[PDB]
C-alpha cells in the first residue's frame, strides 16, 4: 500500500464522514420540474490505528445512483488513507428532495410599473433549518426604482446587478415566506418584449437531497487490540444549491 503508511497508532480512534451534495433544478413557473440532478461526494476524515479494513454502507426510503467513481483504495470496502480523502463521487436524478419551491407572480401595470410577488415554500422536516438563503429576482433593464417589503429577511435592489436580492438567515421546514416588489419602469422600444430571466436561489440544508443516509461504516483491525465498537463515528450532511432556477 502506497497511500497509507504503517505503524499509525491513534489513542482516540475517530471517524468523520461528510456527505456533500449540490441539488440542481430548473422549474417552470407553474411548478413542473424541467430538469434536476444531485451531484454528491463523500469525504472521510479518518483517525484509525494501523491498517484498518472498512465497509461503507448506505441505502443503494432508498436511492438510485446513476454513476459512481471511487477512490483507488476501494475494491463497498477499502483500507482508507490517514486523514482527509474523498471516498466517492456520485450523481442521482430520481426521487430528489427539492428543498424549496419558488412560486413567482408578475402583474404588468400599463407600460409603467411591475407588481411582483415571490413565495418560498420550504419542503423538509420542520425540525431542520435551512441556512444562507438568497433569492434573486431579475428586474428589467429600464427600471428607475424598485420598492419592496419583506417580512422574513432583508432585501436590497442591487441595480448594478440588475436584480432584487432577498437574503434570509434561517428557515424551518414546512413553512413559507414571501416578498413583494413594485418595479417602476422607464419607457422603451415596445418592439422588444423583455426576456424574463428565472428566479435563482441559494440555500444550505442539513440533509442530502438525494435522500442519502449512511447505514454503517464498520472498521476491522485484526492485528491491533481494538474492534468496531471502539471507534467514535460522526456524520454530517450538507446540501448546497447549485443551479436552482424557477422559470419566469
Amino acid at each position: 500500500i502506497g497511500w497509507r503508511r504503517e505503524g499509525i497508532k491513534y489513542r482516540r480512534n475517530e471517524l468523520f464522514l461528510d456527505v456533500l451534495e449540490s441539488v440542481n433544478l430548473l422549474m417552470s413557473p407553474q411548478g413542473q420540474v424541467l430538469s434536476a440532478h444531485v451531484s454528491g461526494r463523500v469525504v472521510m476524515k479518518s483517525y484509525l490505528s494501523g491498517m484498518p479494513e472498512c465497509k461503507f454502507g448506505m441505502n443503494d426510503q432508498s436511492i438510485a445512483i446513476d454513476d459512481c467513481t471511487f477512490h483507488q483504495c476501494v475494491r463497498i470496502s477499502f483500507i482508507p488513507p490517514d486523514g482527509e480523502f474523498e471516498l466517492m463521487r456520485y450523481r442521482t436524478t430520481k426521487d430528489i428532495i427539492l428543498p424549496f419551491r419558488v412560486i413567482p407572480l408578475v402583474r404588468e401595470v400599463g407600460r409603467t410599473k411591475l407588481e411582483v410577488k415571490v413565495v418560498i415554500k420550504s419542503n423538509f422536516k420542520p425540525s431542520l433549518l435551512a441556512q444562507k438563503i438568497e433569492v434573486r429576482i431579475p428586474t428589467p433593464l429600464n427600471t428607475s426604482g424598485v420598492q419592496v417589503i419583506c417580512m422574513k429577511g432583508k432585501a436590497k435592489y442591487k441595480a448594478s446587478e440588475n436584480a432584487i436580492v432577498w437574503k434570509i438567515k434561517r428557515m424551518a421546514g414546512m413553512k413559507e415566506s414571501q416578498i413583494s416588489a413594485e418595479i417602476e419602469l422607464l419607457p422603451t422600444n415596445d418592439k422588444k418584449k423583455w426576456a424574463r430571466p428565472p428566479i435563482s436561489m441559494n440555500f444550505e440544508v442539513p440533509f442530502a437531497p438525494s435522500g442519502l443516509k449512511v447505514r454503517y461504516l464498520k472498521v476491522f483491525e485484526p492485528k491491533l487490540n481494538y474492534s468496531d465498537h471502539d471507534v467514535i463515528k460522526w456524520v454530517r450532511y450538507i446540501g448546497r444549491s447549485g443551479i436552482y432556477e424557477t422559470r419566469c
Binding site: 471517524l15 468523520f16 464522514l17 454502507g57 449512511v214 447505514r215 454503517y216 461504516l217 464498520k218 463515528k233 460522526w234 456524520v235 454530517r236
Partner: peptide, 9 residues
C-alpha cells in the same frame, strides 16, 4: 455540526 453515527446493522 457532526452528529453521532448509530449502527444500523
Amino acid at each position: 455540526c457532526y452528529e453521532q453515527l448509530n449502527d444500523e446493522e
